[PDB]
Symmetry: C2
Subunit: 304 residues, 2 copies
Protein backbone atom coordinates (compact mmCIF):
# COMPACT_ATOMS: atom_id res chain seq x y z
CA UNK A 1 0.00 0.00 0.00
CA UNK A 2 3.03 2.33 0.12
CA UNK A 3 5.12 3.63 -2.77
CA UNK A 4 8.09 6.02 -2.65
CA UNK A 5 8.75 8.26 -5.65
CA UNK A 6 12.08 9.96 -6.34
CA UNK A 7 12.88 12.64 -8.88
CA UNK A 8 16.42 13.63 -9.88
CA UNK A 9 16.28 17.00 -11.61
CA UNK A 10 19.19 17.61 -14.01
CA UNK A 11 19.78 20.51 -16.39
CA UNK A 12 18.45 18.56 -19.37
CA UNK A 13 16.64 15.45 -17.99
CA UNK A 14 14.26 14.69 -15.10
CA UNK A 15 14.65 11.10 -13.93
CA UNK A 16 11.85 9.35 -12.04
CA UNK A 17 11.80 6.18 -9.99
CA UNK A 18 9.16 4.41 -7.88
CA UNK A 19 10.19 2.07 -5.05
CA UNK A 20 7.96 -0.42 -3.18
CA UNK A 21 7.91 -1.10 0.58
CA UNK A 22 10.97 -3.34 0.10
CA UNK A 23 12.84 -0.48 -1.65
CA UNK A 24 12.77 -2.39 -4.96
CA UNK A 25 12.58 -0.10 -7.97
CA UNK A 26 9.40 -0.92 -9.86
CA UNK A 27 9.19 2.03 -12.27
CA UNK A 28 11.74 4.13 -14.19
CA UNK A 29 10.86 7.08 -16.42
CA UNK A 30 12.93 9.92 -17.99
CA UNK A 31 11.53 13.17 -19.37
CA UNK A 32 13.12 16.37 -20.73
CA UNK A 33 13.70 19.19 -18.24
CA UNK A 34 11.92 22.34 -19.60
CA UNK A 35 14.54 24.99 -20.46
CA UNK A 36 12.51 28.12 -19.63
CA UNK A 37 8.92 27.57 -18.53
CA UNK A 38 8.23 27.05 -14.81
CA UNK A 39 4.64 26.02 -15.60
CA UNK A 40 6.00 23.32 -17.94
CA UNK A 41 8.46 22.24 -15.22
CA UNK A 42 5.68 21.74 -12.62
CA UNK A 43 3.51 19.91 -15.19
CA UNK A 44 6.27 17.41 -15.96
CA UNK A 45 6.57 16.46 -12.29
CA UNK A 46 2.83 16.51 -11.48
CA UNK A 47 2.13 14.34 -14.56
CA UNK A 48 4.71 11.75 -13.52
CA UNK A 49 3.27 11.57 -9.99
CA UNK A 50 -0.39 11.30 -11.12
CA UNK A 51 0.42 8.64 -13.73
CA UNK A 52 2.39 6.58 -11.20
CA UNK A 53 -0.41 6.88 -8.63
CA UNK A 54 -2.93 5.58 -11.24
CA UNK A 55 -0.54 2.78 -12.24
CA UNK A 56 0.27 1.57 -8.73
CA UNK A 57 -3.11 2.31 -7.17
CA UNK A 58 -1.66 4.36 -4.27
CA UNK A 59 -0.77 7.94 -3.40
CA UNK A 60 3.04 7.80 -3.48
CA UNK A 61 5.39 9.97 -1.39
CA UNK A 62 7.38 12.59 -3.32
CA UNK A 63 11.08 13.38 -2.86
CA UNK A 64 13.16 15.53 -5.24
CA UNK A 65 16.96 15.79 -5.62
CA UNK A 66 18.30 19.10 -7.04
CA UNK A 67 21.77 20.51 -7.99
CA UNK A 68 21.48 23.23 -5.36
CA UNK A 69 19.25 23.87 -2.36
CA UNK A 70 15.91 25.37 -1.48
CA UNK A 71 16.20 28.50 0.66
CA UNK A 72 15.12 27.25 4.07
CA UNK A 73 13.18 30.46 4.90
CA UNK A 74 11.56 31.44 1.56
CA UNK A 75 11.33 28.03 -0.16
CA UNK A 76 12.89 29.51 -3.31
CA UNK A 77 15.23 27.27 -5.29
CA UNK A 78 18.91 28.19 -5.59
CA UNK A 79 19.69 26.00 -8.61
CA UNK A 80 21.67 27.85 -11.27
CA UNK A 81 21.77 24.74 -13.52
CA UNK A 82 17.92 24.69 -13.66
CA UNK A 83 16.88 28.12 -15.04
CA UNK A 84 13.24 27.04 -15.38
CA UNK A 85 12.90 26.50 -11.59
CA UNK A 86 15.49 29.03 -10.31
CA UNK A 87 13.91 31.35 -7.76
CA UNK A 88 10.60 29.45 -7.55
CA UNK A 89 8.87 27.99 -4.47
CA UNK A 90 8.93 24.42 -5.89
CA UNK A 91 7.96 22.59 -2.72
CA UNK A 92 4.90 24.74 -1.90
CA UNK A 93 3.76 24.72 -5.54
CA UNK A 94 4.02 20.94 -5.76
CA UNK A 95 2.32 20.46 -2.37
CA UNK A 96 -0.63 22.50 -3.63
CA UNK A 97 -0.85 20.61 -6.96
CA UNK A 98 -0.31 17.12 -5.47
CA UNK A 99 -2.21 17.60 -2.19
CA UNK A 100 0.56 15.89 -0.17
CA UNK A 101 3.92 16.85 1.46
CA UNK A 102 6.98 17.12 -0.79
CA UNK A 103 10.66 16.89 0.23
CA UNK A 104 13.47 18.59 -1.68
CA UNK A 105 17.16 17.95 -0.98
CA UNK A 106 20.54 18.69 -2.47
CA UNK A 107 21.87 15.95 -4.77
CA UNK A 108 24.86 15.16 -2.50
CA UNK A 109 22.48 14.42 0.39
CA UNK A 110 20.47 12.15 -1.95
CA UNK A 111 23.70 10.38 -2.98
CA UNK A 112 24.62 9.68 0.66
CA UNK A 113 21.08 8.54 1.60
CA UNK A 114 20.97 6.23 -1.43
CA UNK A 115 24.22 4.57 -0.31
CA UNK A 116 23.11 4.46 3.35
CA UNK A 117 20.04 2.41 2.35
CA UNK A 118 22.10 -0.26 0.59
CA UNK A 119 21.34 -3.63 2.26
CA UNK A 120 24.94 -3.73 3.57
CA UNK A 121 24.62 -0.35 5.38
CA UNK A 122 21.03 -0.49 6.66
CA UNK A 123 21.02 -0.11 10.40
CA UNK A 124 24.37 1.77 10.49
CA UNK A 125 23.94 4.65 13.00
CA UNK A 126 25.78 7.12 10.74
CA UNK A 127 26.96 7.34 7.14
CA UNK A 128 29.04 10.11 5.55
CA UNK A 129 28.88 10.31 1.76
CA UNK A 130 31.63 12.30 -0.02
CA UNK A 131 31.62 12.96 -3.76
CA UNK A 132 35.12 13.71 -5.04
CA UNK A 133 34.52 15.23 -8.47
CA UNK A 134 35.09 18.77 -9.69
CA UNK A 135 34.37 19.75 -6.09
CA UNK A 136 33.86 17.91 -2.78
CA UNK A 137 30.17 17.28 -1.99
CA UNK A 138 29.03 15.78 1.31
CA UNK A 139 25.95 14.18 2.83
CA UNK A 140 25.38 13.38 6.53
CA UNK A 141 23.03 10.48 7.36
CA UNK A 142 22.15 9.54 10.96
CA UNK A 143 19.92 6.52 11.63
CA UNK A 144 18.91 6.39 7.96
CA UNK A 145 17.81 10.02 7.80
CA UNK A 146 19.41 13.05 6.05
CA UNK A 147 20.59 15.83 8.35
CA UNK A 148 19.77 18.84 6.12
CA UNK A 149 21.04 21.51 8.51
CA UNK A 150 19.73 24.89 9.69
CA UNK A 151 20.01 26.34 6.15
CA UNK A 152 19.99 23.14 4.08
CA UNK A 153 23.77 23.16 3.74
CA UNK A 154 24.93 20.51 6.25
CA UNK A 155 27.61 18.44 4.58
CA UNK A 156 29.40 21.35 2.81
CA UNK A 157 32.69 19.83 4.00
CA UNK A 158 34.26 21.10 0.79
CA UNK A 159 34.05 24.69 2.08
CA UNK A 160 36.01 24.15 5.28
CA UNK A 161 39.63 25.41 5.29
CA UNK A 162 42.75 23.23 5.19
CA UNK A 163 43.68 22.31 8.82
CA UNK A 164 47.06 23.26 10.33
CA UNK A 165 48.43 19.74 9.91
CA UNK A 166 47.52 19.69 6.21
CA UNK A 167 49.20 23.09 5.74
CA UNK A 168 52.31 21.71 7.47
CA UNK A 169 52.50 18.77 5.05
CA UNK A 170 52.24 21.17 2.10
CA UNK A 171 54.97 23.60 3.39
CA UNK A 172 53.11 25.95 5.76
CA UNK A 173 53.71 29.52 4.47
CA UNK A 174 54.87 28.04 1.15
CA UNK A 175 51.77 25.79 0.77
CA UNK A 176 49.56 26.37 -2.32
CA UNK A 177 46.52 28.35 -1.20
CA UNK A 178 43.96 27.70 -3.97
CA UNK A 179 41.20 30.29 -4.44
CA UNK A 180 37.71 28.90 -4.02
CA UNK A 181 34.50 29.31 -6.00
CA UNK A 182 32.84 30.21 -2.67
CA UNK A 183 35.15 33.26 -2.66
CA UNK A 184 36.90 32.17 0.55
CA UNK A 185 40.30 30.60 0.09
CA UNK A 186 42.12 27.38 0.91
CA UNK A 187 38.82 25.41 1.06
CA UNK A 188 39.43 21.66 0.84
CA UNK A 189 37.04 21.57 -2.17
CA UNK A 190 40.11 22.63 -4.20
CA UNK A 191 42.49 19.95 -2.83
CA UNK A 192 40.65 16.68 -2.27
CA UNK A 193 38.35 16.62 -5.33
CA UNK A 194 39.46 15.22 -8.71
CA UNK A 195 40.15 18.80 -9.76
CA UNK A 196 42.11 19.32 -6.50
CA UNK A 197 44.18 16.21 -7.23
CA UNK A 198 45.02 17.75 -10.63
CA UNK A 199 45.75 21.24 -9.26
CA UNK A 200 48.12 19.88 -6.60
CA UNK A 201 49.95 17.88 -9.25
CA UNK A 202 50.34 20.97 -11.47
CA UNK A 203 51.43 23.22 -8.58
CA UNK A 204 54.30 20.96 -7.57
CA UNK A 205 55.34 19.45 -10.92
CA UNK A 206 54.51 22.31 -13.38
CA UNK A 207 52.59 20.14 -15.82
CA UNK A 208 48.83 20.20 -16.29
CA UNK A 209 47.72 16.54 -16.40
CA UNK A 210 44.25 15.07 -15.87
CA UNK A 211 43.70 12.74 -12.92
CA UNK A 212 43.57 9.58 -15.17
CA UNK A 213 46.88 10.60 -16.85
CA UNK A 214 48.54 11.07 -13.42
CA UNK A 215 47.17 7.74 -12.20
CA UNK A 216 48.37 5.99 -15.40
CA UNK A 217 51.82 7.49 -14.80
CA UNK A 218 51.64 6.37 -11.16
CA UNK A 219 50.94 2.80 -12.22
CA UNK A 220 54.01 2.96 -14.53
CA UNK A 221 56.21 3.99 -11.58
CA UNK A 222 56.97 7.43 -13.00
CA UNK A 223 58.65 9.25 -10.10
CA UNK A 224 56.72 12.56 -10.24
CA UNK A 225 53.33 10.81 -10.21
CA UNK A 226 54.54 8.52 -7.39
CA UNK A 227 55.57 11.57 -5.32
CA UNK A 228 52.27 13.33 -6.09
CA UNK A 229 50.21 10.28 -5.06
CA UNK A 230 52.20 9.91 -1.82
CA UNK A 231 51.55 13.59 -0.98
CA UNK A 232 47.88 13.33 -2.02
CA UNK A 233 47.11 10.20 0.07
CA UNK A 234 48.74 11.75 3.14
CA UNK A 235 46.89 15.03 2.57
CA UNK A 236 43.58 13.19 2.17
CA UNK A 237 44.23 11.15 5.37
CA UNK A 238 45.05 14.30 7.38
CA UNK A 239 41.99 16.23 6.20
CA UNK A 240 39.64 13.27 6.65
CA UNK A 241 41.14 12.55 10.11
CA UNK A 242 40.20 16.10 11.14
CA UNK A 243 36.66 15.62 9.81
CA UNK A 244 36.38 12.18 11.46
CA UNK A 245 37.51 13.51 14.88
CA UNK A 246 34.43 15.78 14.85
CA UNK A 247 31.92 13.43 13.12
CA UNK A 248 33.23 9.90 13.95
CA UNK A 249 31.13 8.34 11.12
CA UNK A 250 30.50 4.57 11.15
CA UNK A 251 30.79 4.33 7.34
CA UNK A 252 32.26 6.65 4.72
CA UNK A 253 31.12 6.20 1.12
CA UNK A 254 33.09 7.80 -1.72
CA UNK A 255 31.57 8.82 -5.07
CA UNK A 256 32.68 10.94 -8.05
CA UNK A 257 35.45 10.24 -10.57
CA UNK A 258 38.24 10.12 -7.99
CA UNK A 259 36.45 7.39 -6.00
CA UNK A 260 37.47 5.08 -8.88
CA UNK A 261 41.11 5.40 -7.78
CA UNK A 262 41.20 2.05 -5.90
CA UNK A 263 44.45 2.85 -4.10
CA UNK A 264 42.43 5.25 -1.85
CA UNK A 265 40.73 2.29 -0.09
CA UNK A 266 44.12 0.68 0.62
CA UNK A 267 46.00 3.81 1.71
CA UNK A 268 43.42 5.54 3.94
CA UNK A 269 43.27 2.74 6.58
CA UNK A 270 47.09 2.78 6.73
CA UNK A 271 47.50 6.54 7.02
CA UNK A 272 44.50 7.66 9.09
CA UNK A 273 45.59 6.25 12.54
CA UNK A 274 48.55 8.65 12.93
CA UNK A 275 46.21 11.65 12.58
CA UNK A 276 43.24 10.35 14.59
CA UNK A 277 42.95 10.23 18.40
CA UNK A 278 44.76 7.34 20.05
CA UNK A 279 41.40 5.78 21.07
CA UNK A 280 39.76 6.35 17.65
CA UNK A 281 38.80 3.44 15.39
CA UNK A 282 38.62 3.49 11.59
CA UNK A 283 35.26 3.87 9.83
CA UNK A 284 34.42 1.42 7.10
CA UNK A 285 35.48 3.26 3.90
CA UNK A 286 33.94 2.03 0.62
CA UNK A 287 33.29 3.08 -2.96
CA UNK A 288 29.69 4.03 -3.83
CA UNK A 289 27.64 1.09 -5.15
CA UNK A 290 24.58 2.80 -6.68
CA UNK A 291 26.09 5.03 -9.37
CA UNK A 292 23.65 6.67 -11.80
CA UNK A 293 20.62 5.46 -9.78
CA UNK A 294 21.74 7.41 -6.71
CA UNK A 295 19.82 10.61 -7.35
CA UNK A 296 16.41 8.91 -7.77
CA UNK A 297 17.01 6.41 -4.95
CA UNK A 298 18.02 9.03 -2.39
CA UNK A 299 15.26 11.41 -3.37
CA UNK A 300 12.69 8.60 -2.95
CA UNK A 301 14.23 7.52 0.37
CA UNK A 302 13.72 11.00 1.85
CA UNK A 303 10.23 9.82 2.81
CA UNK A 304 11.11 6.48 4.45
CA UNK B 1 3.79 0.02 35.13
CA UNK B 2 4.61 3.62 34.13
CA UNK B 3 7.71 4.79 32.28
CA UNK B 4 10.54 6.01 34.49
CA UNK B 5 13.90 7.26 33.24
CA UNK B 6 16.94 7.02 35.51
CA UNK B 7 20.14 8.97 34.97
CA UNK B 8 23.47 8.70 36.71
CA UNK B 9 26.29 11.23 36.58
CA UNK B 10 29.52 9.54 37.69
CA UNK B 11 32.10 11.95 39.08
CA UNK B 12 35.45 11.34 40.75
CA UNK B 13 34.00 11.75 44.24
CA UNK B 14 30.19 11.69 43.91
CA UNK B 15 27.62 9.67 41.95
CA UNK B 16 24.49 11.73 41.30
CA UNK B 17 21.17 10.03 40.57
CA UNK B 18 17.93 11.32 39.10
CA UNK B 19 14.60 9.75 38.16
CA UNK B 20 12.28 11.43 35.63
CA UNK B 21 8.68 10.31 34.93
CA UNK B 22 6.90 10.16 31.56
CA UNK B 23 6.37 13.94 31.72
CA UNK B 24 10.09 14.48 32.52
CA UNK B 25 9.24 15.61 36.05
CA UNK B 26 12.14 14.86 38.34
CA UNK B 27 10.81 12.55 41.05
CA UNK B 28 14.05 11.37 42.70
CA UNK B 29 17.41 12.89 43.49
CA UNK B 30 20.21 11.14 45.37
CA UNK B 31 23.96 11.77 45.82
CA UNK B 32 26.31 8.99 47.03
CA UNK B 33 30.10 8.69 47.35
CA UNK B 34 31.96 7.24 44.37
CA UNK B 35 34.03 4.26 45.66
CA UNK B 36 37.74 5.08 45.32
CA UNK B 37 39.09 1.58 44.63
CA UNK B 38 36.53 -1.20 44.71
CA UNK B 39 34.74 -2.05 41.44
CA UNK B 40 32.39 -4.30 43.42
CA UNK B 41 31.42 -1.34 45.62
CA UNK B 42 31.04 0.85 42.49
CA UNK B 43 28.52 -1.55 40.91
CA UNK B 44 26.66 -1.93 44.23
CA UNK B 45 26.17 1.83 44.60
CA UNK B 46 24.51 2.02 41.17
CA UNK B 47 22.51 -1.23 41.44
CA UNK B 48 21.21 -0.16 44.89
CA UNK B 49 19.98 3.19 43.58
CA UNK B 50 18.19 1.52 40.64
CA UNK B 51 16.55 -1.20 42.78
CA UNK B 52 15.44 1.25 45.50
CA UNK B 53 13.89 3.57 42.91
CA UNK B 54 12.16 0.67 41.13
CA UNK B 55 10.61 -0.47 44.46
CA UNK B 56 9.65 3.09 45.43
CA UNK B 57 7.94 4.01 42.16
CA UNK B 58 6.71 0.51 41.24
CA UNK B 59 8.50 0.55 37.86
CA UNK B 60 11.49 -0.96 36.08
CA UNK B 61 13.28 2.26 35.12
CA UNK B 62 15.53 2.73 32.03
CA UNK B 63 19.19 3.32 32.92
CA UNK B 64 21.52 5.91 31.39
CA UNK B 65 24.98 6.81 32.75
CA UNK B 66 27.16 9.85 31.99
CA UNK B 67 30.95 9.38 32.55
CA UNK B 68 34.07 11.63 32.26
CA UNK B 69 35.44 9.46 29.46
CA UNK B 70 34.07 6.79 27.13
CA UNK B 71 33.41 3.10 26.97
CA UNK B 72 35.55 1.28 24.42
CA UNK B 73 33.00 0.52 21.70
CA UNK B 74 34.59 -2.91 20.93
CA UNK B 75 35.52 -4.27 24.39
CA UNK B 76 33.05 -2.38 26.62
CA UNK B 77 35.89 -1.37 28.95
CA UNK B 78 35.74 2.09 30.50
CA UNK B 79 38.36 4.71 29.61
CA UNK B 80 37.80 7.03 32.57
CA UNK B 81 41.02 8.20 34.21
CA UNK B 82 39.11 10.25 36.85
CA UNK B 83 37.27 7.07 38.06
CA UNK B 84 39.98 4.54 39.10
CA UNK B 85 37.42 2.14 40.59
CA UNK B 86 35.75 1.59 37.19
CA UNK B 87 38.74 2.18 34.88
CA UNK B 88 39.17 -0.81 32.56
CA UNK B 89 35.90 -2.51 33.59
CA UNK B 90 33.00 -3.66 31.39
CA UNK B 91 30.47 -1.43 33.23
CA UNK B 92 27.64 -1.77 30.75
CA UNK B 93 27.73 -5.58 30.54
CA UNK B 94 28.12 -5.94 34.31
CA UNK B 95 25.17 -3.63 35.04
CA UNK B 96 23.04 -5.27 32.36
CA UNK B 97 23.62 -8.62 34.10
CA UNK B 98 22.81 -7.29 37.59
CA UNK B 99 19.79 -5.21 36.53
CA UNK B 100 18.38 -7.50 33.82
CA UNK B 101 17.84 -4.60 31.39
CA UNK B 102 19.77 -2.52 28.78
CA UNK B 103 22.16 0.15 30.03
CA UNK B 104 23.38 3.16 28.05
CA UNK B 105 26.72 4.82 28.85
CA UNK B 106 27.80 8.11 27.27
CA UNK B 107 30.50 10.74 27.61
CA UNK B 108 29.50 13.65 29.86
CA UNK B 109 29.65 16.19 27.00
CA UNK B 110 27.07 14.16 25.06
CA UNK B 111 24.86 14.14 28.19
CA UNK B 112 25.30 17.90 28.52
CA UNK B 113 24.16 18.48 24.93
CA UNK B 114 21.20 16.05 25.18
CA UNK B 115 20.08 17.70 28.44
CA UNK B 116 20.01 21.08 26.67
CA UNK B 117 18.35 19.65 23.54
CA UNK B 118 15.41 18.41 25.66
CA UNK B 119 14.73 21.83 27.21
CA UNK B 120 11.19 22.96 26.23
CA UNK B 121 12.62 25.74 24.03
CA UNK B 122 14.75 23.28 21.97
CA UNK B 123 12.43 20.27 21.73
CA UNK B 124 11.66 19.65 18.14
CA UNK B 125 14.90 21.27 16.89
CA UNK B 126 16.28 18.88 14.20
CA UNK B 127 19.89 19.36 15.45
CA UNK B 128 21.67 20.70 18.52
CA UNK B 129 25.44 21.17 18.98
CA UNK B 130 26.61 21.50 22.59
CA UNK B 131 30.11 22.91 23.16
CA UNK B 132 31.65 23.11 26.63
CA UNK B 133 34.37 25.78 26.80
CA UNK B 134 36.27 24.97 30.02
CA UNK B 135 39.78 23.63 30.51
CA UNK B 136 39.27 22.00 27.12
CA UNK B 137 36.59 22.06 24.40
CA UNK B 138 33.97 19.29 24.77
CA UNK B 139 31.26 18.65 22.17
CA UNK B 140 27.97 16.80 21.84
CA UNK B 141 26.04 16.18 18.59
CA UNK B 142 22.25 15.72 18.88
CA UNK B 143 20.04 14.99 15.84
CA UNK B 144 16.24 14.74 16.25
CA UNK B 145 16.65 14.56 20.03
CA UNK B 146 19.11 11.67 19.96
CA UNK B 147 22.89 11.55 20.69
CA UNK B 148 25.14 10.69 17.77
CA UNK B 149 27.82 8.69 19.69
CA UNK B 150 30.03 7.92 16.69
CA UNK B 151 31.80 4.80 15.40
CA UNK B 152 34.08 4.73 18.48
CA UNK B 153 32.06 6.86 20.93
CA UNK B 154 34.04 10.01 20.21
CA UNK B 155 31.74 11.99 17.89
CA UNK B 156 31.90 15.62 19.01
CA UNK B 157 35.66 15.69 19.81
CA UNK B 158 35.76 19.08 18.06
CA UNK B 159 38.47 20.10 20.47
CA UNK B 160 40.94 17.72 18.76
CA UNK B 161 40.60 19.18 15.29
CA UNK B 162 43.43 21.47 14.07
CA UNK B 163 43.24 25.23 13.57
CA UNK B 164 41.89 25.89 10.03
CA UNK B 165 43.95 27.93 7.55
CA UNK B 166 41.83 31.05 8.08
CA UNK B 167 42.35 30.88 11.88
CA UNK B 168 46.10 30.49 11.39
CA UNK B 169 46.10 33.53 9.09
CA UNK B 170 44.41 35.65 11.78
CA UNK B 171 47.07 34.54 14.29
CA UNK B 172 50.07 35.30 11.99
CA UNK B 173 50.46 32.12 9.89
CA UNK B 174 54.07 30.92 10.37
CA UNK B 175 54.33 33.18 13.43
CA UNK B 176 51.05 31.91 14.98
CA UNK B 177 51.29 30.33 18.46
CA UNK B 178 51.14 26.57 17.99
CA UNK B 179 50.04 25.19 21.38
CA UNK B 180 50.91 21.55 22.20
CA UNK B 181 47.92 19.34 22.92
CA UNK B 182 47.20 16.71 25.58
CA UNK B 183 46.21 14.36 22.72
CA UNK B 184 49.85 14.62 21.60
CA UNK B 185 48.93 16.27 18.29
CA UNK B 186 49.45 19.99 18.08
CA UNK B 187 47.51 23.12 17.31
CA UNK B 188 44.21 21.42 18.30
CA UNK B 189 41.52 24.06 18.91
CA UNK B 190 41.04 22.58 22.43
CA UNK B 191 44.02 24.83 23.36
CA UNK B 192 42.63 28.04 21.82
CA UNK B 193 38.87 28.24 22.26
CA UNK B 194 38.55 26.88 25.83
CA UNK B 195 38.86 29.11 28.93
CA UNK B 196 42.44 27.87 29.21
CA UNK B 197 42.98 28.64 25.49
CA UNK B 198 41.67 32.18 26.06
CA UNK B 199 44.27 32.57 28.84
CA UNK B 200 47.16 31.07 26.86
CA UNK B 201 46.43 33.32 23.84
CA UNK B 202 46.39 36.37 26.13
CA UNK B 203 49.75 35.38 27.65
CA UNK B 204 51.33 34.62 24.27
CA UNK B 205 50.56 38.03 22.82
CA UNK B 206 50.71 40.29 25.88
CA UNK B 207 53.42 38.52 27.94
CA UNK B 208 51.45 38.47 31.22
CA UNK B 209 49.79 35.44 32.76
CA UNK B 210 46.23 36.48 33.76
CA UNK B 211 43.20 34.28 34.43
CA UNK B 212 40.17 34.57 32.14
CA UNK B 213 38.14 36.48 34.83
CA UNK B 214 41.03 38.98 35.30
CA UNK B 215 41.23 39.56 31.52
CA UNK B 216 37.46 39.99 31.28
CA UNK B 217 37.48 42.42 34.26
CA UNK B 218 40.18 44.42 32.47
CA UNK B 219 38.16 44.27 29.24
CA UNK B 220 35.18 45.74 31.07
CA UNK B 221 37.44 48.59 32.32
CA UNK B 222 38.48 49.37 28.72
CA UNK B 223 42.13 48.35 29.34
CA UNK B 224 43.88 48.38 25.93
CA UNK B 225 45.53 44.95 26.01
CA UNK B 226 42.39 43.13 27.19
CA UNK B 227 40.36 44.95 24.51
CA UNK B 228 42.80 43.81 21.81
CA UNK B 229 42.90 40.25 23.16
CA UNK B 230 39.07 40.04 23.22
CA UNK B 231 38.88 41.40 19.65
CA UNK B 232 41.35 38.71 18.50
CA UNK B 233 39.62 35.99 20.54
CA UNK B 234 36.10 36.76 19.26
CA UNK B 235 37.30 36.75 15.65
CA UNK B 236 39.22 33.50 16.22
CA UNK B 237 36.15 31.89 17.79
CA UNK B 238 33.97 33.07 14.86
CA UNK B 239 36.41 31.67 12.29
CA UNK B 240 36.80 28.28 13.93
CA UNK B 241 33.05 27.96 14.56
CA UNK B 242 32.23 29.04 10.98
CA UNK B 243 34.39 26.15 9.72
CA UNK B 244 32.59 23.72 12.06
CA UNK B 245 29.19 25.16 11.05
CA UNK B 246 29.94 24.81 7.29
CA UNK B 247 30.24 21.06 7.87
CA UNK B 248 27.52 20.57 10.52
CA UNK B 249 25.06 23.48 9.90
CA UNK B 250 23.50 23.02 13.38
CA UNK B 251 20.09 24.55 14.14
CA UNK B 252 21.05 25.51 17.69
CA UNK B 253 24.43 25.80 19.39
CA UNK B 254 24.50 25.71 23.18
CA UNK B 255 27.61 26.84 25.09
CA UNK B 256 28.62 25.53 28.52
CA UNK B 257 31.74 25.74 30.71
CA UNK B 258 33.22 28.77 32.47
CA UNK B 259 33.78 30.76 29.27
CA UNK B 260 30.09 30.45 28.34
CA UNK B 261 29.53 33.02 31.12
CA UNK B 262 31.28 35.66 28.99
CA UNK B 263 28.08 37.39 27.74
CA UNK B 264 29.86 39.30 24.98
CA UNK B 265 30.23 35.98 23.04
CA UNK B 266 26.47 35.93 22.29
CA UNK B 267 26.64 39.50 20.95
CA UNK B 268 29.83 39.17 18.90
CA UNK B 269 29.37 35.75 17.23
CA UNK B 270 26.27 36.78 15.17
CA UNK B 271 28.21 39.86 14.02
CA UNK B 272 31.40 38.05 13.04
CA UNK B 273 30.25 34.67 11.72
CA UNK B 274 28.69 35.78 8.36
CA UNK B 275 32.03 36.83 6.78
CA UNK B 276 33.39 33.30 7.32
CA UNK B 277 30.25 31.30 6.45
CA UNK B 278 28.98 30.50 2.93
CA UNK B 279 27.07 33.38 1.32
CA UNK B 280 23.81 31.34 1.47
CA UNK B 281 24.39 30.19 5.09
CA UNK B 282 22.14 31.38 7.93
CA UNK B 283 23.17 31.79 11.59
CA UNK B 284 22.28 29.06 14.11
CA UNK B 285 20.61 30.15 17.30
CA UNK B 286 23.53 30.46 19.76
CA UNK B 287 22.66 30.44 23.47
CA UNK B 288 24.17 29.85 26.88
CA UNK B 289 23.40 26.45 28.51
CA UNK B 290 20.25 26.60 30.68
CA UNK B 291 21.02 23.67 33.02
CA UNK B 292 24.66 24.42 34.01
CA UNK B 293 26.88 21.65 35.33
CA UNK B 294 23.70 19.97 36.67
CA UNK B 295 22.51 18.47 33.34
CA UNK B 296 24.70 15.35 33.54
CA UNK B 297 21.79 13.53 35.30
CA UNK B 298 19.19 14.86 32.88
CA UNK B 299 21.16 13.95 29.75
CA UNK B 300 22.03 10.50 31.05
CA UNK B 301 18.35 9.81 31.85
CA UNK B 302 17.25 11.16 28.43
CA UNK B 303 19.48 8.68 26.58
CA UNK B 304 16.52 6.30 26.83
CA UNK B 305 13.73 8.61 25.60
CL1 LIG C 1 17.84 0.94 -7.28
ZN1 LIG D 1 35.05 27.46 -0.53
ZN1 LIG E 1 44.47 17.46 20.52
Amino acid sequence: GTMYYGFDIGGTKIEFGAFDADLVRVARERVATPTESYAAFLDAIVTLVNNADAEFGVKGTVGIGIPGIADVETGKLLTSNIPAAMGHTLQRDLEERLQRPVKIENDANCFALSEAWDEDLRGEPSVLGLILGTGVGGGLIFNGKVHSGRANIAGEIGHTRLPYDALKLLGMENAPIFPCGCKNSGCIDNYLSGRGFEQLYDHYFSEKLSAPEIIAHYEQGERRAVQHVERFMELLAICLANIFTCLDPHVVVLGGGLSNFELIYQELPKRLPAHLLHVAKLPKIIKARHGDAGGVRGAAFLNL
